[PDB]
Amino acid sequence: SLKLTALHFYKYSEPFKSQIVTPKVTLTHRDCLFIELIDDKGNAYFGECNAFQTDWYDHETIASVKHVIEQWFEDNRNKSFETYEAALKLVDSLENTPAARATIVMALYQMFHVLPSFSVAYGATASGLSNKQLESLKATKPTRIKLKWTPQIMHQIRVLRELDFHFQLVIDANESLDRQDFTQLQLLAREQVLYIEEPFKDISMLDEVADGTIPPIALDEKATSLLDIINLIELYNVKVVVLKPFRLGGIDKVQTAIDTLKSHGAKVVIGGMYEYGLSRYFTAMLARKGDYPGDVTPAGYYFEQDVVAHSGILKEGRLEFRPPLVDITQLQPYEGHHHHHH
Ligand SMILES: [Mg+2]
């Protein structure tokens, strides 16, 4: 049997190697909330929250999650549970706050499973084709390349198809295309594109092009909740869904979501978002459940220093993962007398 006796909040905030610049936000650092739950035997387990400092991506933030988890602990502390299933029952009331729920579930999961060491396929992401990017692709030989849609897309695919290795091609249009892009979208269909992520901000635009004359469509930004994903699938021609575990409420909600989405005729790709090494491990762990290889980010892609080192090290086309062990000296108390600044 187990009982949760203590809860501590920490913060980690490393700078992005390359400043993040998107229409929705500018990020210099990845502020992140971490929780630590200690059981009645003094065993500590950590959870990584995927919420951001502000609501540019979602309504849940680091602050809102902290408050939710803090209250949750007050209501569940000292309660005994003997199984993972029983543990999950305590968070059933947090389904309205998926980011908070997912953070707690990440910790609970570790209390009942022996974490394996494993690898996942390496999928490269290119926002363009600089020499640095091209040389990286040639040296690493990814089995999948996700190219960002830009005015140079066709001129860049021409270069990629001359690489000496075969790969699946995915295009990410970032909800940026318009009616003037129809012709190129149809031409892209002849380039063996596995799927194109979010061609239009207004998904209804899909009804304006002949079905089957453009690449398979995937939801990413629009894959907000299982219910909403199903609603979009039933209304528009969607074939692929990029699922982020935290948006579903956590690790335990992934399989059921995948089964449901498959019953609706959609394929699933597990993905992450600016994660540190702890959450990255679990996103990678779930990757195998998908119909296509997961969208797992390599170690060191965003941050020079991580809270969990060697989490997703690229080796001969695959990302290697080890059971995640948080380096506590990297974490800082979230608030209180022990939260210091210099
Ligand atoms: Mg995307």
Side-chain angles (χ1 to χ4, degrees):
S1 181
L2 301 176
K3 297 182 179 183
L4 301 179
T5 70
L7 164 65
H8 300 302
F9 290 106
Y10 302 92
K11 178 185 179 183
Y12 194 56
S13 188
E14 291 299 307
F16 278 101
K17 287 180 180 183
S18 295
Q19 182 169 303
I20 297 300
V21 186
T22 73
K24 292 177 173 296
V25 72
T26 292
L27 296 174
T28 58
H29 297 67
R30 172 62 213 297
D31 292 298
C32 191
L33 179 74
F34 280 81
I35 68 171
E36 176 188 28
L37 287 172
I38 306 174
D39 66 15
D40 60 303
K41 293 182 306 307
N43 300 316
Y45 296 91
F46 293 87
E48 180 177 328
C49 178
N50 275 51
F52 298 98
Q53 204 62 75
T54 60
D55 75 331
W56 61 273
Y57 185 74
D58 183 59
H59 74 285
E60 292 190 73
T61 58
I62 285 174
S64 70
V65 169
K66 185 273 185 174
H67 287 160
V68 172
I69 297 179
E70 183 163 46
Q71 183 61 56
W72 175 82
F73 183 68
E74 284 301 300
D75 304 315
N76 291 284
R77 60 187 306 180
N78 300 306
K79 290 183 176 179
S80 64
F81 50 85
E82 290 178 56
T83 68
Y84 177 51
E85 289 69 18
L88 293 177
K89 266 67 282 180
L90 303 182
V91 298
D92 286 311
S93 67
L94 300 181
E95 295 187 0
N96 46 297
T97 52
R101 183 178 185 289
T103 307
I104 295 170
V105 169
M106 191 178 300
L108 299 178
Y109 186 89
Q110 298 170 69
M111 296 176 203
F112 298 100
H113 301 81
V114 173
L115 304 183
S117 69
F118 62 85
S119 68
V120 298
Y122 168 48
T125 57
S127 296
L129 205 56
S130 65
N131 182 64
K132 185 163 181 297
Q133 180 60 273
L134 185 51
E135 287 306 300
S136 180
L137 294 175
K138 288 175 175 178
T140 60
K141 307 197 307 174
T143 50
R144 186 261 292 303
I145 298 174
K146 186 168 73 68
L147 181 63
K148 174 179 181 175
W149 179 297
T150 72
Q152 283 294 108
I153 186 173
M154 307 307 294
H155 301 306
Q156 286 173 4
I157 288 173
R158 191 156 170 159
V159 178
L160 297 181
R161 290 310 190 189
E162 294 300 306
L163 290 166
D164 62 19
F165 60 89
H166 179 252
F167 60 83
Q168 285 306 318
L169 175 67
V170 166
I171 299 300
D172 191 336
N174 304 99
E175 300 179 298
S176 73
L177 308 186
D178 57 55
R179 295 190 176 67
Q180 315 313 306
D181 295 308
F182 285 14
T183 295
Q184 195 160 193
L185 274 170
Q186 296 181 301
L187 218 57
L188 192 61
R190 300 177 187 175
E191 297 302 322
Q192 307 82 54
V193 173
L194 194 60
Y195 58 81
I196 176 168
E197 289 182 17
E198 306 288 2
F200 311 111
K201 179 62 176 59
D202 183 336
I203 189 166
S204 75
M205 287 275 280
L206 290 177
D207 307 70
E208 294 173 46
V209 299
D211 180 281
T213 60
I214 57 173
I217 303 299
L219 301 178
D220 178 356
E221 278 66 27
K222 297 182 182 64
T224 49
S225 68
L226 179 57
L227 293 179
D228 279 346
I229 292 171
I230 295 172
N231 287 326
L232 292 174
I233 290 174
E234 292 296 341
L235 299 170
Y236 311 102
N237 187 53
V238 175
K239 285 184 167 297
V240 179
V241 177
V242 179
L243 292 182
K244 288 173 173 56
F246 74 86
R247 278 191 156 299
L248 298 176
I251 299 170
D252 69 308
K253 299 290 181 178
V254 174
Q255 194 57 63
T256 55
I258 291 175
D259 295 335
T260 298
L261 294 180
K262 290 182 61 58
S263 74
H264 283 276
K267 286 184 176 177
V268 173
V269 175
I270 300 302
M273 180 165 273
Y274 310 131
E275 305 164 283
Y276 280 115
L278 182 57
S279 177
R280 194 185 307 132
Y281 173 86
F282 295 100
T283 292
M285 184 186 80
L286 293 168
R288 67 177 74 81
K289 290 181 177 298
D291 294 288
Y292 289 132
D295 247 50
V296 186
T297 307
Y301 188 76
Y302 296 120
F303 320 111
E304 181 68 8
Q305 176 64 246
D306 205 312
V307 285
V308 177
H310 303 105
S311 194
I313 296 295
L314 177 60
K315 300 194 182 181
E316 311 181 312
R318 298 182 65 70
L319 303 179
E320 294 291 351
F321 288 87
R322 63 167 53 211
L325 303 188
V326 166
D327 176 355
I328 63 101
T329 67
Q330 288 285 156
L331 295 179
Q332 298 287 174
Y334 178 77
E335 66 182 355
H337 288 61
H338 312 300
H339 168 207
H340 293 178
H341 68 157
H342 307 280

CSV table of all heavy atoms in Angstrom, one decimal, residues 172 197 220-221, ligand 1:
chain,number,residue,atom,x,y,z
A,172,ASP,N,4.7,20.7,-42.8
A,172,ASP,CA,4.0,21.4,-41.7
A,172,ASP,C,3.7,22.8,-42.3
A,172,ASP,O,4.6,23.6,-42.5
A,172,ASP,CB,4.8,21.5,-40.4
A,172,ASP,CG,3.9,22.0,-39.3
A,172,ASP,OD1,2.9,22.7,-39.5
A,172,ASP,OD2,4.3,21.7,-38.1
A,197,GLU,N,0.6,18.8,-42.2
A,197,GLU,CA,0.0,19.3,-40.9
A,197,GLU,C,-0.6,20.7,-41.1
A,197,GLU,O,0.0,21.6,-41.6
A,197,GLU,CB,1.0,19.4,-39.8
A,197,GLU,CG,1.5,18.1,-39.3
A,197,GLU,CD,2.5,18.2,-38.1
A,197,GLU,OE1,2.6,19.3,-37.6
A,197,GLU,OE2,3.2,17.2,-37.8
A,220,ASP,N,-2.8,19.2,-35.8
A,220,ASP,CA,-1.7,19.4,-34.8
A,220,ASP,C,-2.2,20.4,-33.8
A,220,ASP,O,-2.7,20.1,-32.7
A,220,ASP,CB,-0.4,19.9,-35.5
A,220,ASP,CG,0.7,20.1,-34.4
A,220,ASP,OD1,0.4,20.0,-33.2
A,220,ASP,OD2,1.9,20.4,-34.9
A,221,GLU,N,-2.1,21.7,-34.2
A,221,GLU,CA,-2.6,22.8,-33.4
A,221,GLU,C,-4.1,22.6,-33.0
A,221,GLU,O,-4.5,22.9,-31.9
A,221,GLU,CB,-2.5,24.1,-34.1
A,221,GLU,CG,-1.1,24.8,-34.0
A,221,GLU,CD,-0.1,24.0,-34.8
A,221,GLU,OE1,-0.4,23.3,-35.7
A,221,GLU,OE2,1.1,24.2,-34.4
B,1,MG,MG,3.0,21.1,-36.5
